[PDB]
Design a protein around this ligand. Structure first.
Ligand code: NAP
Ligand code: 8QL
Length: 313
């Protein structure tokens, strides 16, 4: 755990659930809990939260864990920023998860998108279609949720310092963002954005810590952290896997990390990261692999407002 401005305890390692398929995700979450995971990262857009919910309700009753020891996170999709929709999204998420409250609710992407069914609505240009409500509007609706004891804190994802500044400077702000969940690994180090978020008492949660291989768009030329020779060199030095090393890198930097898996053996491997330490040389070396490479760069909505990736941090 990394303590939040809330004086609350987010576990430093959690299980990611994007692309975890129906039928394998329940068991993945069950295994996760037995192996000691308590933080689980979820999203409405993942279309598997109900199955994640089944896993949690079981272990709960089964007495393998207590709900206050769990830390469950979900996100709000940009096509749902309009106030009545923020609440419909949330209730679906909450109900699927079979929870009475979320520990953190995040805005998934900063730019609001045209409402409807297309999760990614575009023009016959391929470009995305903006909507009426902004993320500020969404935050207001989200703030209501914390007042009712249904969410315990709020956070953002895929926000640049600019978006965070815009949010912290909002009139009437009732609730501050606890974390900024972004892509982070040795190819995308994120030094400035982390510096910035820490200087504001906002934690950083690193997504795609392993390089997201299984992302659909993966091209074979694309860099590959899991088979990086120099990463595997350092892993071997510690009788550990490359995945282990990639995960531990964040922890040593005070950054929360959430690797994804539905393979039981790997789910277990990915948390045996509290029994070894990378040296200073090893961090410095791994830090110097930065390439400003992003595995999740599919949206490309540079034309719309508040596009996070164009900025330096
Ligand atoms: N806020 C956001 O926008 C956002 C974006 C992206 C991701 N995320 C979150 O962060 C998590 C990040 O992961 P990702 O799925 O995007 O990428 P990732 O964790 O970096 O990659 C997952 C891949 O690694 C494989 N894998 C897992 N553990 C392994 C190990 N020990 N050895 C070898 N291979 C291993 C998995 O395969 P198996 O599953 O088959 O084991 C899966 O194919 C997500 O699941 C999601 O919860 C959030
Ligand atoms: C094609 C979609 C529409 C359905 C969801 C798809 C993916 C889902 C993914 O979680 C994601 C997260 C954020 O980094 C935003 C970008 C992607 C890559 C996203 C692009 C749009």
């Amino acid at each position: 755990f990394v303590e939040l401005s809330t004086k609350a305890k987010m576990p430093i390692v959690g299980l990611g659930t994007w692309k975890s398929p129906l039928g394998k995700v329940k068991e993945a979450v069950k295994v996760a809990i037995d192996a000691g995971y308590r933080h689980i990262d979820c999203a409405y857009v993942y279309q598997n939260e109900h199955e994640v919910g089944e896993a949690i309700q079981e272990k709960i009753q089964e007495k393998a864990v207590k709900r206050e020891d769990l830390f469950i996170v979900s996100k709000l999709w940009p096509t749902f920023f309009e106030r009545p929709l923020v609440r419909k999204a949330f209730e679906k998420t909450l109900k699927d998860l079979k929870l009475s409250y979320l520990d953190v609710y995040l805005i998934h992407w900063p730019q609001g998108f045209k409402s409807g069914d297309d999760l990614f609505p575009k023009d016959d240009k391929g470009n995305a279609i903006g909507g009426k409500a902004t993320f500020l509007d969404a935050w207001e609706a989200m703030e209501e949720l914390v007042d009712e004891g249904l969410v315990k804190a709020l956070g953002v994802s895929n926000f640049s310092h600019f978006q965070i500044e815009k949010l912290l400077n909002k009139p009437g702000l009732k609730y501050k963002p606890v974390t900024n969940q972004v892509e982070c690994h040795p190819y995308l180090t994120q030094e400035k954005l982390i510096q910035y978020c820490h200087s504001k008492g906002i934690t950083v949660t690193a997504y795609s810590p392993l390089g997201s291989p299984d992302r659909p768009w993966a091209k074979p030329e694309d860099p590959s952290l899991l088979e990086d020779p120099k990463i595997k060199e350092i892993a071997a030095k510690h009788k550990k896997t490359a995945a282990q090393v990639l995960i531990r890198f964040h922890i040593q930097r005070n950054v929360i990390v959430i690797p994804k898996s539905v393979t039981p053996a790997r789910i277990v491997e990915n948390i045996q990261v509290f029994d070894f330490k990378l040296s200073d040389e090893e961090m410095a070396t791994i830090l110097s692999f930065n390439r400003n490479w992003r595995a999740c760069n599919v949206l490309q909505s540079s034309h719309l407002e508040d596009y996070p990736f164009n900025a330096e941090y």
